[PDB]
Amino acid sequence: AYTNSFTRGVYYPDKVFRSSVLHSTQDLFLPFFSNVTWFHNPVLPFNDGVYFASTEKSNIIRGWIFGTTLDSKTQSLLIVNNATNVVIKVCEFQFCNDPFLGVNCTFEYVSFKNLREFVFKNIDGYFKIYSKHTPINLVRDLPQGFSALEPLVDLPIGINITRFQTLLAAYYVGYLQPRTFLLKYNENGTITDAVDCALDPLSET
Amino acid sequence: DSTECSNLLLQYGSFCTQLNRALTGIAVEQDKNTQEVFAQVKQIYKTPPIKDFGGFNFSQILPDPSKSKRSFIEDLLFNKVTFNGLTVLPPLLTDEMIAQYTSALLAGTITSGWTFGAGAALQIPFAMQMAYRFNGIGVTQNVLYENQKLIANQFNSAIGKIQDSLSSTASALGKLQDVVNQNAQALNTLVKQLSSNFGAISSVLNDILSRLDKVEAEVQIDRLITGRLQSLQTYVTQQLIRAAEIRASANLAATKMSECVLGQSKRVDFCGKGYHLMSFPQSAPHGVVFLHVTYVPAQEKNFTTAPAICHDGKAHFPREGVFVSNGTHWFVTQRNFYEPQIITTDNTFVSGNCDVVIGIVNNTVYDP
Amino acid sequence: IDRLITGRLQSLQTYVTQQLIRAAEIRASANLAATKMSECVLGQSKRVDFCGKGYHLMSFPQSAPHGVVFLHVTYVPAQEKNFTTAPAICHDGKAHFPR
Amino acid sequence: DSTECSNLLLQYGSFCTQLNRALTGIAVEQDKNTQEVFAQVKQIYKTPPI
Amino acid sequence: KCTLKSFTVEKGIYQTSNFRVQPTESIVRFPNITNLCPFGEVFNATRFASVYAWNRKRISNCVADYSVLYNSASFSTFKCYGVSPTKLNDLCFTNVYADSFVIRGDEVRQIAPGQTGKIADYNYKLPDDFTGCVIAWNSNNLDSKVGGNYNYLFRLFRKSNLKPFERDISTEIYQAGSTPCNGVEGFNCYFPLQSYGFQPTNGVGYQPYRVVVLSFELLHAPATVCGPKKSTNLVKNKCVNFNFNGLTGTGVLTESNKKFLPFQQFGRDIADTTDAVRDPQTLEILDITPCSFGGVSVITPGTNTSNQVAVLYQGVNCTEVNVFQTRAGCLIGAEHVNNSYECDIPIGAGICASYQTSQSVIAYTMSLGAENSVAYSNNSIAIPTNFTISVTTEILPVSMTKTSVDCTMYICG
Ligand SMILES: *[C@@H]1O[C@H](CO)[C@@H](O[C@@H]2O[C@H](CO)[C@@H](O)[C@H](O)[C@H]2NC(C)=O)[C@H](O)[C@H]1NC(C)=O
Ligand SMILES: *[C@@H]1O[C@H](CO)[C@@H](O)[C@H](O)[C@H]1NC(C)=O
Ligand SMILES: *[C@@H]1O[C@H](CO)[C@@H](O)[C@H](O)[C@H]1NC(C)=O
Ligand SMILES: *[C@@H]1O[C@H](CO)[C@@H](O)[C@H](O)[C@H]1NC(C)=O
Ligand SMILES: *[C@@H]1O[C@H](CO)[C@@H](O)[C@H](O)[C@H]1NC(C)=O
Ligand SMILES: *[C@@H]1O[C@H](CO)[C@@H](O)[C@H](O)[C@H]1NC(C)=O
Ligand SMILES: *[C@@H]1O[C@H](CO)[C@@H](O)[C@H](O)[C@H]1NC(C)=O
Ligand SMILES: *[C@@H]1O[C@H](CO)[C@@H](O)[C@H](O)[C@H]1NC(C)=O
Ligand SMILES: *[C@@H]1O[C@H](CO)[C@@H](O)[C@H](O)[C@H]1NC(C)=O
Ligand SMILES: *[C@@H]1O[C@H](CO)[C@@H](O)[C@H](O)[C@H]1NC(C)=O
Ligand SMILES: *[C@@H]1O[C@H](CO)[C@@H](O)[C@H](O)[C@H]1NC(C)=O
Ligand SMILES: *[C@@H]1O[C@H](CO)[C@@H](O)[C@H](O)[C@H]1NC(C)=O
């Protein structure tokens, strides 16, 4: 199944305040009006990076797994919401072939009503995470509008990632691509709008 | 202010001295460009305490003493046009000094006509100055005095339309705004070029000096020096080319000051369209505005015409004006305004007989 | 040697670029001087302040090194007096204007 | 149209864009120069048949 | 004179230099010193390993204050190899390792690059290129006992020698003859481990020592162990050199009304220039302003007249540098005169200067000309009763000097 992304999946590209200005930047972004794969839990490619989102009121989705094998032979990232707190580890996990939560390790870290959105990318040995949360007018499809995902964590892992999978009900997956975006920063220094410069000839203009 | 970079820049010799000399020539020329437009008045002339100008109302182009001491239109003009080693230098004449010059040029023009440009300002009544400007376009001066209220109302109305335009739109001021925009884009480009690598390991000069040891850092810094020196040579060359265009524009404005404001030009289209009467200078940000007043002919009629007329075998030609007929009678009129007069021996001159002229017509010439 | 070639070629390109910009200013000045020769020496100009200050009578060219000098001869009015004035005068119930 | 060269040329920053902007200003001026000479007449006047 | 390359100077204003306010001091700021590496549980703990079975600690994701080791008098020997110990407070590494054991005071000499003998051969081997540190202390007070301590062992016998860091902990019988071992000693068959049997009476080479060996690596994966960041106090309203989080610069730091979002650390201008920062210790937003700079111009009458000059610090306030403030800059050595004249030497913003009377450079607001109320009325005319013939001079440039260059003789020759 497939759905439209609209203008979703923009995130703050750097740790820099800018105010009442239009800033042009090239990065891995989810292209505007691209389609996204829709699910109601296969192993998936990671490509250059992933946009992930879900509509939620119930804590069905708990975490993610990232690596090349995602299984035993080599180290893989694991991210889990341990109810009260987030837990992150990078062990060579000998865990299940079809993992879920029922109704050595070179690093470790500890931290429907809504749409909850996330972006994952793994540039030059750092695993980046960005996120945002909002109320919604529609349960079954991505909400038309604009808000930018803010960085959560920036982890010095150095692991090769080529695949991922989700740990568990609607969720969406889109792939980032190297794109130039023009980002509109307001007086509070928030990104409030964007142009995808390769969408159409007016956007190039 | 990296001392390691500064000692490598010594190897390039005169280049930074001759870039500063080139920009200093541009800066000194901007004061000269301004002085040649506005400082064309020998004395700061001022207008009398009462405005007895024959019904012409200059209050919106004259200074407002309640305010800088700019006119009402000069305030509309001033509202509608809008440190990496970089500096901006102040102009020699302040905006208040430029407004005293336009005030003196305007006051000299209104109180003395074309005379303050030739020598001492000689006073003349404003309707009598306008009558001489009607003779200057080839209209007889009784056409002014017989229409003086109409001419004054048409002027006062046409000045009101300038206020309405400059209050509601900036479309014509794009010439002055483009000069502000081009210099701002050129400086933003020069500063943005400090973010570039030019092939170096980093665009940041302290960063190079931390990542590499002395001899390897020196090779990477020379790429930043090479690219930044080229980046600045590109800016200074473009400012030299752009200043040559602004000097051509300032020489034109200085010639319009002399020929349109200090005089009455015969030159077609030099002081606006129609026959030039007079014009008024108003100051603007980085520029001048001329309000050109012209006579435009408005309501033509067809007439039959002839080059000459026959009387007692003599061919008569008009001394000034042209022969016309209303279909039955023949008259002489001035060329630029229909005012018909009876053809007489003192409206005309004789030359030879009736045989030579192609299209001559027979008539009485009255002898007073 | 390629460092000397690069710097000396940039040094010479900078000189030729500034001589091209400077020659355009001298051409504008020579076009102005050629116009003053026609209009101020070969004629009598009615253009205000084109041939010096005051009303132009005539002007004379003198040569100078790399230039020209114009000696502009003008009429300047000198000793004004105040008078009462009128635009027209009445006679036999009719208005007369100065011819 | 070498990509290997094009990605090195990006390291020189604004130079390429400001060369295109300069030549575009030349080109727009040539049409202006032509309007200022020829487009002075308000109406397309015609001579009579005789 | 040196700016113009001349012993004679004509009247004018000449830029001779640039003024630039120098930094008064250097600031360094980094986040509060935290997540120190766990070395107290390596060095200061109660238990310690036998040399045949050394405990290895892996050190990662932390700040390593090596000065707590190298400045401490707590050690009988401290050494580092390939790297100076004082430089380990600056260096950062992908991983670090600490290997720990109890050893007799003589066999401590076998804890070195590429060594040989029973410890290097059969217990703990370091490679010939070992880059790292070794820290050793006598432990006769802890690790010796009356009648001999049985807690501490070494391997005497093995089939072959150890490779670098080969952590073999086996008790297998070494055999060198035809009689089978079957898991016990016999003819040419030997149990591999022996006790040191440490006693407090022993001579120094037979006393126990505790030892830790430190190894470092920097790889393609980012440095997880790093040098502890020092920091200064924070200085406002003065020109300083600065470093926040490794963003270095020079400027004046001031309190600001900017509203950074919680993740944002720096603020940027329209043209990429950094114009604000967050202090990483106490999260204020500081506006960064350049230290004051501008041209220095020397205002001179010609040297034919006098040697006096005035100096203009262009766009500078006199607080940063007779002394007089103008909108053109701070003006020094010119007398301010408040009776106006035609502009002699132009300074800017309506100000000019001249050399005048007891004689000095003077500075004044320029005069545009004399005032004149023209005697206008709707009734009066002025008519000239006489004339003057005037002769006026105009000078115009017509040509340059014609120049040619042989570019091959200029460049090469
Ligand atoms: C041409 O102009 C003359 C006036 O100069 C007109 O002649 C007068 O016409 C009125 C009646 O309309 C008579 O009362 C006058 O006595 C006429 N004056 C003279 C001098 O004859 C004439 O009508 C005009 N012709 C046309 C075709 O309009
Ligand atoms: C979504 O995109 C894929 C790949 O371009 C395409 O195969 C698929 O048909 C698209 N689906 C929709 C509904 O646009
Ligand atoms: C900016 O921040 C202020 C508080 O600092 C807030 O009142 C305002 O709503 C924000 N947004 C805009 C557009 O000013
Ligand atoms: C002159 O024009 C202004 C603007 O319309 C008006 O306010 C003023 O009353 C006029 N004065 C006279 C004497 O007509
Ligand atoms: C003059 O006469 C011709 C023919 O009647 C006509 O086309 C033209 O419009 C007339 N012009 C005027 C000013 O009446
Ligand atoms: C105008 O042309 C006619 C013939 O159509 C001729 O009779 C007349 O003399 C001409 N007049 C002039 C002024 O040429
Ligand atoms: C003009 O008058 C003369 C003398 O009466 C006559 O010979 C001639 O034919 C007339 N011309 C015209 C055009 O009527
Ligand atoms: C002309 O009249 C005015 C006003 O009375 C007076 O100031 C001036 O001195 C008079 N003389 C001349 C020669 O202008
Ligand atoms: C750093 O330590 C100081 C000690 O006074 C404290 O006030 C401040 O909150 C701490 N900041 C952070 C970011 O931990
Ligand atoms: C110069 O500096 C002082 C102290 O900051 C300030 O009070 C004064 O207004 C400044 N004047 C100018 C012209 O900058
Ligand atoms: C400057 O002006 C003051 C009055 O404001 C006056 O007392 C003083 O003498 C003047 N100084 C000079 C040197 O002109
Ligand atoms: C006119 O001026 C000259 C000096 O320029 C003088 O000698 C002569 O007497 C004056 N004539 C009259 C009538 O004032």
Please tell me the distance from the alpha carbon of residue E128 to that of residue B368, in angstroms, as a whole number.
136
Q: Could you tell me the CA-to-CA distances from B314 to B182, B318, B368, C84, E288 in Å, in that order?
A: 69, 13, 17, 45, 95
Please tell me the distance from the alpha carbon of residue B304 to that of residue E92, in angstroms, as a whole number.
104
Please tell me the distance from the alpha carbon of residue E161 to that of residue B42, in angstroms, as a whole number.
107
Please tell me the distance from the alpha carbon of residue E326 to that of residue E328, in angstroms, as a whole number.
5
Q: Provide the shortest C-alpha distance from residue A33 to chain E (in Å).
A: 28
Q: Which atom of ligand 4 is nearest to the CA of B57?
A: 1
Phi and psi, residue B27, nearest 5° = -65, -45
Please tell me the distance from the alpha carbon of residue B303 to that of residue B324, in angstroms, as a whole number.
6
Q: What is the largest CA-CA distance in chain D?
A: 70
For residue E112, give every residue at least 6 positions away whose Cβ sits within 8 Å of its Cβ, in sequence order, or none: E126, E130, E134
Task: Specify whether the CB–CB gap between C72 and E395 falls below 8 A.
Answer: no
Please tell me the distance from the alpha carbon of residue E194 to that of residue E187, in angstroms, as a whole number.
18
Single-letter code of the amino acid located at E50 = S
Q: Could you tell me the CA-to-CA distances from B159 to B70, B169, B292, B308, E266 in Å, in that order?
A: 17, 16, 10, 43, 53
Q: Which residues of B275-289 are buried (b: 16+ CB within 10 A; e: fewer)?
A: bbbbbbbbbbbbbbb
Q: Could you tell me the CA-to-CA distances from E93 to D1, E97, E216 in Å, in that order?
A: 42, 11, 7
How many other CB atoms are found less than 10 A from the CB of residue B220? 20
Breaks in chain E after (C-N > 2.5 angstroms): 321, 357
How many other CB atoms are found less than 10 A from the CB of residue A141? 14
CB-closest option in B195, B238, B269 to D13:
B195
Please tell me the distance from the alpha carbon of residue B148 to that of residue A51, in angstroms, as a whole number.
79
Phi and psi, residue E408, nearest 5° = -70, -35
Which of E95, E268, E275 should we substitute to test contact with A (largest number of A Cβ atoms within 10 Å)?
Answer: E268
Strands, DSSP E only, in E105-173?
132-138, 153-155
Task: Specify whether the CB–CB gap between E206 and E139 falls below 8 A.
Answer: no
A90 CA to centre of own chain: 18
How many other CB atoms are found less than 10 A from the CB of residue B152? 19
Task: Specify whether the CB–CB gap between B168 and B71 falls below 8 A.
Answer: no
Query: How many CA atoms lie within 13 Å of E36's alpha carbon, on the beta-carbon side?
Result: 10
Tokens representing C20?
């091209």
Task: Specify whether the CB–CB gap between E324 and E331 falls below 8 A.
Answer: yes
Q: Is C63 exposed, middle or buried (0-12, 13-18, 19+ CB in 10 A)?
A: exposed
Q: Could you tell me the CA-to-CA distances from C49 to A205, B258, B280 in Å, in that order?
A: 50, 6, 17
Please tell me the distance from the alpha carbon of residue B346 to that of residue B318, in angstroms, as a whole number.
9
Task: Specify whether the CB–CB gap between B286 and B298 falls below 8 A.
Answer: no
- In the DSSP assignment, the letter for residue B258 is I
Method by which the model was determined? cryo-EM
Q: A32 in helix, strand or coil?
A: coil
Q: Which residues pair with A39 in a beta bridge?
A: A171
Please tell me the distance from the alpha carbon of residue B152 to that of residue B130, in angstroms, as a whole number.
10
Phi and psi, residue A54, nearest 5° = -145, 155
Please tell me the distance from the alpha carbon of residue E38 to that of residue E35, in angstroms, as a whole number.
9
> Which chains neighbour D (Cβ–Cβ under 8 Å, 3 or more pairs)?
B
Complete domains list, chain A, with CATH = 2-205 (2.60.120.960)
Q: Provide the shortest C-alpha distance from residue D12 to chain B (in Å).
A: 5
Ligand 11 mean position, distance from CA B307 (Å): 76
Q: Which candidate, E104, E135, E137, E294, places its Cα nearest to that of E212?
A: E135
Q: What is the 3-state secondary structure (H, E, C) of B111-153?
A: HHCCHHHHCCCCCCCHHHHHHHHHHHCCCCCHHHHCCHHHHHH
Q: Could you tell me the CA-to-CA distances from E170 to B344, E85, E100 in Å, in that order?
A: 145, 35, 18
- In the DSSP assignment, the letter for residue E401 is P
What does the DSSP assignment read for E160-183? SPPPTT------PPEE-SSS--TT
What does the DSSP assignment read for C28-68? HHHHHHHHHIIIIISS---STTTSSSSEEEEEEEEEETTEE
What does the DSSP assignment read for A172-185? EEEE-EEEEEEEEE
Tokens representing A179?
């794109």
**Resolution in Å, one decimal place:** 2.8
How many other CB atoms are found less than 10 A from the CB of residue B102? 26
Query: How many CA atoms lie within 13 Å of C83's alpha carbon, on the beta-carbon side?
Result: 11
Please tell me the distance from the alpha carbon of residue B21 to that of residue B13, in angstroms, as a whole number.
14
Query: How many CA atoms lie within 13 Å of E295's alpha carbon, on the beta-carbon side?
Result: 18
Token look-up 């610090």 returns E313
Tokens representing B146?
């017989």
Phi and psi, residue E159, nearest 5° = -60, -35
For residue E19, give every residue at least 6 positions away whose Cβ sits within 8 Å of its Cβ, in sequence order, or none: E292, E293, E294, E295, E296, E313, E316, E321
CA torsion sign, E298 to E304 to E305 to E307?
positive
Phi and psi, residue B159, nearest 5° = -65, -40
Whether D12 sits inside 8 A of B196 (CB atoms) is yes
Length of chain B: 368
How many other CB atoms are found less than 10 A from the CB of residue E61? 15
CA torsion, ordered B115, B119, B121, B125, to nearest 10 deg: -30
Tokens representing B148?
């003086």
Please tell me the distance from the alpha carbon of residue E214 to that of residue E43, in angstroms, as a whole number.
12
CB-closest option in E271, E350, E368 to B191:
E271
Question: Is C28 an interface residue toward E (CB < 8 Å)?
Answer: no
Give helix then strand counts, H and E, for chain C: 1, 5
Task: Specify whether the CB–CB gap between E289 and E251 falls below 8 A.
Answer: yes
Question: Is C26 an interface residue toward E (CB < 8 Å)?
Answer: yes
Q: Could you tell me the CA-to-CA distances from C52 to A45, A188, B198, E328 in Å, in that order?
A: 84, 62, 55, 34
CB-closest option in E20, E350, E381 to B94:
E350
Task: Specify whether the CB–CB gap between E217 and E262 falls below 8 A.
Answer: no
Task: Specify whether the CB–CB gap between B309 and B360 falls below 8 A.
Answer: yes
Task: Specify whether the CB–CB gap between E79 and E130 falls below 8 A.
Answer: no
CA torsion, ordered C18, C24, C30, C31, to nearest 10 deg: -170
Task: Specify whether the CB–CB gap between E231 and E28 falls below 8 A.
Answer: yes
Angle at B279 between CA B277 and CA B284, to 5 degrees: 165
| C61 interaction partners in chain E (CB closer than 8 Å) | none
Task: Specify whether the CB–CB gap between E317 and E28 falls below 8 A.
Answer: no
Q: Provide the shortest C-alpha distance from residue B241 to chain E (in Å).
A: 19
Token look-up 């050394």 returns E54
What does the DSSP assignment read for B156-168? HHHHHHHHHHHHH
Tokens representing A79?
């991210």
Q: Which candidate, E208, E211, E209, places its Cα nearest to that of E100?
A: E211
Ligand 3 mean position, distance from CA E257 (Å): 12
Q: A197 in helix, strand or coil?
A: coil
Tokens representing E148?
């001999």
Task: Specify whether the CB–CB gap between E407 and C12 falls below 8 A.
Answer: yes
Single-letter code of the amino acid located at D31 = D
Phi and psi, residue B124, nearest 5° = -150, 145
Question: Is B195 an interface residue toward D (CB < 8 Å)?
Answer: yes
Breaks in chain C after (C-N > 2.5 angstroms): none
Give the closest residue (by CA) to ligand 4 atom 8: B59
Tokens representing E191?
């149990």
Q: Which candidate, C53, C85, C88, places its Cα nearest to that of C72?
A: C53
Task: Specify whether the CB–CB gap between E315 and E15 falls below 8 A.
Answer: no
Phi and psi, residue B32, nearest 5° = -60, -45
For residue A20, give every residue at least 6 positions away whose Cβ sits within 8 Å of its Cβ, in sequence order, or none: A185, A186, A187
Whether C29 sits inside 8 A of E403 (CB atoms) is no
Using only the alpha carbons of chain A, give its radius of gyration. 17
Length of chain D: 50
Q: Which candidate, E308, E273, E306, places its Cα nearest to that of E287?
A: E273
Task: Specify whether the CB–CB gap between B271 and B292 falls below 8 A.
Answer: yes
Q: Which helix (H) or strand (E) holds A131?
A: strand A127-135
Ligand nearest to the CA of C81: 8
Give the closest residue (by CA) to ligand 12 atom 10: E386
Length of chain C: 99
Task: Specify whether the CB–CB gap between E61 and E92 falls below 8 A.
Answer: no
Task: Please provide the distance, in angstroms rounded to a whole number, between the alpha carbons at the two ends of chain B.
Answer: 95
Tokens representing E379?
């009734």
E325 lines ligand 10 (CB under 6 A): yes
Q: Which residues pair with E355 in a beta bridge?
A: E361
Single-letter code of the amino acid located at E340 = S
Token look-up 């900036």 returns B170
Task: Specify whether the CB–CB gap between B364 and B323 falls below 8 A.
Answer: no
Please tell me the distance from the alpha carbon of residue B96 to that of residue E32, in angstroms, as a whole number.
56
How many other CB atoms are found less than 10 A from the CB of residue E62? 16
Q: What is the largest CA-CA distance in chain B?
A: 113
Q: E253 in helix, strand or coil?
A: strand
- In the DSSP assignment, the letter for residue B260 is I
For residue E156, give every residue at least 6 positions away whose Cβ sits within 8 Å of its Cβ, in sequence order, or none: E118, E122, E190, E192, E193, E194
Q: Which candidate, A99, A106, A45, A49, places its Cα nearest to that of A74?
A: A106
Q: E333 in helix, strand or coil?
A: coil
Ligand nearest to the CA of E34: 9
Q: Which candidate, B251, B256, B252, B250, places its Cα nearest to that of B117?
A: B256
Task: Specify whether the CB–CB gap between A72 and A178 falls below 8 A.
Answer: no
Please tell me the distance from the alpha carbon of residue E244 to that of residue E31, in angstroms, as a whole number.
9
For residue E152, give every residue at least 6 positions away whose Cβ sits within 8 Å of its Cβ, in sequence order, or none: E50, E51, E102, E143, E195, E196, E198, E208
Q: B346 in helix, strand or coil?
A: coil
Instruction: Count chain A–chain E contacts defined by CB atoms under 8 A.
Output: 57
Task: Please provide the distance, in angstroms rounded to a whole number, between the alpha carbons at the two ends of chain E.
Answer: 33
B257 CA to centre of own chain: 7
Please tell me the distance from the alpha carbon of residue A15 to that of residue A151, in angstroms, as a whole number.
9
What does the DSSP assignment read for E239-263? EEEEEETTEEEEEEEEE------TT
Query: How many CA atoms lie within 13 Å of A96's alpha carbon, on the beta-carbon side?
Result: 7
| E60 interaction partners in chain A (CB closer than 8 Å) | 106-107
Please tell me the distance from the alpha carbon of residue B1 to that of residue E293, in angstroms, as a whole number.
12
Token look-up 């004379």 returns C60
Single-letter code of the amino acid located at B365 = V
Tokens representing B329?
């009678």
Please tell me the distance from the alpha carbon of residue E80 to that of residue E132, in angstroms, as a whole number.
6
Single-letter code of the amino acid located at A92 = E
CB-closest option in E94, E219, E268 to A18:
E268
Please tell me the distance from the alpha carbon of residue B180 to that of residue B285, in angstroms, as a whole number.
9
Please tell me the distance from the alpha carbon of residue A130 to that of residue A15, in angstroms, as a whole number.
12
Question: Is C33 an interface residue toward B (CB < 8 Å)?
Answer: no
Helices (H), ranges, chain B: 3-9, 15-38, 72-80, 95-112, 115-118, 126-136, 142-145, 148-168, 174-192, 205-211, 214-256
For residue A188, give every residue at least 6 positions away whose Cβ sits within 8 Å of its Cβ, in sequence order, or none: A19, E259, E261
Please tell me the distance from the alpha carbon of residue B239 to that of residue B235, in angstroms, as a whole number.
6
Q: What is the 3-state secondary structure (H, E, C) of E67-101?
A: HHHHCCCCCCEEEEECCCHHHHHCCCECEEEEEEE
Phi and psi, residue B231, nearest 5° = -60, -40
Whether E378 sits inside 8 A of B125 (CB atoms) is yes
Single-letter code of the amino acid located at E356 = Q
Question: Is C77 an interface residue toward E (CB < 8 Å)?
Answer: yes
